[PDB]
Amino acid sequence: HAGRLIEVKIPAPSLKGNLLGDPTEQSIAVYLPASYESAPAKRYPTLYLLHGYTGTNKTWTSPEAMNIRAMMDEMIKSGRVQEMIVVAPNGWNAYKGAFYTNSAVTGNWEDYIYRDLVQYVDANYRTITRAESRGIAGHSMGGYGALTLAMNHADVFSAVYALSPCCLGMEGDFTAENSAWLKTLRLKSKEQISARPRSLEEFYQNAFVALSAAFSPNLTRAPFFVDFPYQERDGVVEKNEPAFAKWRSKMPLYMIGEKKADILKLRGIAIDVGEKEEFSHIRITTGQFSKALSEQNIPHMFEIYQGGTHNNKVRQRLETRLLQFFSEKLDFTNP
């Protein structure tokens, strides 16, 4: 009944040539179910779990956090879910999160997940190598990553679950109504954003620089090598239009029309959000995202759950929704 959590450094060649000094080797965590050693010919579906901004895979693996080893041991032992391998990669970068996106400044972090990571895990652990047996999920930045990766690679991942995803679209606290934007445009050096953010405002400044490096990089500008999607003119913030359209093009809410046929190849799509979600862009755009899917008649599941903040019920969502979702949607048979 005891599974195992393995931590290992793997090659990350898709990150080669990034300008931020991030390494081209990266650590991951892999949960192997309890039967792995006692059933040596069995093969397992795989669930890829992505952490949020400023986070690492310790979000999932730490006993003080989600404690995925203990959770998966009990969930399997109790018969609530079938046995699957769970992979939690690090997606942290010098700006505290790369948003799982390909960028000339941060590296090809999208390629890192669907090529470097998946191919490593499949070559080293007894996975079923079919998209029908591969799921992807995440919280916040990880929900953004999960959705975009599934919409762009439905021949790699067939089921996706986004817990309170960030950056679906430009609404609420992501637009110019956020006073943090004016202070972000005025940042002079990297030392101002070096430390862990101490406040909401610092969190927004850091995230905005990270998103700019991911969505609208600039191999030339200083000090962050980014273009911002906004600009200051006469002390009023306004759209910086070329970089703004780049942001819109990376944002899944505005991608559905373009990707409808690929999205229809997914076996399962789930999105949820807490009634008490404190990031207004998440509250707003998660409902907009389900509406955009439903107006295209795309199968999916959507829930606003009572009393949930951004974080306070994520354990409950794992134990009562997300892990069950993959146990139902993934194919547990091996050809």
Question: Interface with a second copy by CB under 8 A: which residues?
Answer: 51, 54-56, 58-59, 62, 64-65, 177, 191-192, 194-196, 198-201, 260-261, 264-265, 267, 275-276, 278, 283, 286-287, 290-291, 293-295, 297-307, 320, 328
Using CA atoms, how far apart are residues 225 and 55, in angstroms rounded to an integer? 22
Angstrom CA distances, 214 to 40, 100, 250, 319, stand at 41, 8, 9, 32
CB within 8 Å of 10: residues ≥ 6 apart: 25, 26, 27, 28, 116, 117, 120
Helices 280-295, 256-263: inter-axial angle, 10-degree rounding: 60
- Amino acid sitting at position 82: Q
Which residue number, 11 or 172, has a Cβ lying nearer to a second copy? 172
**Min dist. Cβ of residue 279 to a second copy (A):** 11
**Min dist. Cβ of residue 121 to a second copy (A):** 23
Which residue number, 120 or 208, has a Cβ lying nearer to a second copy? 208
**Min dist. Cβ of residue 219 to a second copy (A):** 26
Please say whether the dihedral angle defined by the alpha carbons of residues 209, 214, 217 and 222, taken in this order, is positive or negative: positive
Which residue number, 208 or 325, has a Cβ lying nearer to a second copy? 325
Using CA atoms, how far apart are residues 179 and 287, in angstroms rounded to an integer? 24
Question: CB of 145 within 8 A of CB of 102?
Answer: no
**Min dist. Cβ of residue 255 to a second copy (A):** 14
Which residue number, 22 or 303, has a Cβ lying nearer to a second copy? 303
**Min dist. Cβ of residue 245 to a second copy (A):** 20
**Min dist. Cβ of residue 266 to a second copy (A):** 10
Which residue number, 111 or 201, has a Cβ lying nearer to a second copy? 201
The torsion angle over the Cα atoms of residues 253, 226, 141 and 256, rounded to 10 degrees, is: 20
Which residue number, 29 or 243, has a Cβ lying nearer to a second copy? 29
* Exposure on the CB side of residue 143, measured as CA atoms within 13 A: 25
